[model samples]
Target chain A: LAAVSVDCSEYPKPACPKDYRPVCGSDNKTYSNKCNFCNAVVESNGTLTLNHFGKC
Target chain B: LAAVSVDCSEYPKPACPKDYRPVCGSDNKTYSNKCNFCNAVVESNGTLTLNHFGKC
Candidate 1:
């Protein structure tokens, strides 16, 4: 399946992976292309795990 | 009138601004580069501003 490669290296434990590229932080901060992927929106204590939905 | 210069230049405000910058408002949560513009969003509580209505 041709799917978008989700980068996930900075997420909190239990939900984050150890091997992933860094991604842009919701704080407009760009670390590695890391990310967490899901078919839903994730919001925690004012922090949102966005899909970074946009034209690549 | 010859106008298109409305950059608040700050980064928090008492009550967003009265400018036409469609700058992100209604709280992505914090700042001075803010204000409650007037525009009909695509919903109520989930609609776009009424002022920063169209493109500037």
Candidate 2:
């Protein structure tokens, strides 16, 4: 199996406020917030991650 | 003279948190957050607005 590649964790984690910054995840779904989308990144073992912000 | 166009104020204003969601404004400058960029939209009298969400 190919080794899983991980990027640097320099990304900051801030308290996500109520906003309409919708984002598309690699799983072919939209996340309400960027934080939630990022969480999906780790959960998916990096396979599923953010495609872009503001809906799919 | 062409009248200044003003869109409806249905947009929501949320307390912007510290996050790096860089966005390109109509002035060809990048904003730190969406709120700051959106504020610029109002300040520009609707003449300027967000071009896209990312570094210009």
Candidate 3:
């Protein structure tokens, strides 16, 4: 098998803080905060592993 | 004014991460991650808010 999938329901989605520190994820979306970004990583089951220092 | 027009291109769409952590957004569609949901919030320019964690 060449593919692996994830069920986010099986995982607990993170509840991030509402801080305005922006980060541009590898996907080029701007995360509102570091906690949100980390939560996204977990939700992605690690597919989203890269990010930069500014909003894109 | 009940009729408002939208220019989607003016708002840059996020480069969505292709993961399987689906969540039902306020729009009632499946989003790949919590990041995807929030990015969609920006995509809709605040029209979409809140999400139920898990796939639709």
User: How badly does each model clash, as a count of residue pairs?
Assistant: 23, 0, 0
DockQ of candidate 2 against the true complex: 0.02
For model 3, residues B1-56, the per-residue Cα lDDT tens digits are 11111123333444766777666666878777666666677768768854445555
After TM-score superposition, the amount by which residue A17's alpha carbon in candidate 2 deviates from its true location, in angstroms, is: 21
Evaluated against the true chain A, what TM-score does chain A of model 1 have?
A: 0.30
| TM-score of chain B, candidates 1 onward in order | 0.19, 0.65, 0.58
True contacts kept of 1: 0.00
**What does the lDDT read for residue B56 in candidate 3?**
54
Q: Arrange candidates by DockQ, highest first: which order? A: 3, 1, 2
How many Å off is the CA of A44 in candidate 1? 3.3
- Scored by lDDT, model 1 comes in at 0.31
Tens-digit per-residue lDDT, A1-56, candidate 1: 24343322112224445555544444544434233432111223224343343311
> Over 4 Å off in model 1, which ranges?
A1-15, A31-41, A45-56, B1-56
The candidates' DockQ values read 0.02, 0.02, 0.05
Residue A10 lDDT, candidate 1, scale 0-100: 18
The lDDT for every candidate, in the order shown, is 0.31, 0.54, 0.56
Cα-based TM-score, every candidate: 0.22, 0.39, 0.37
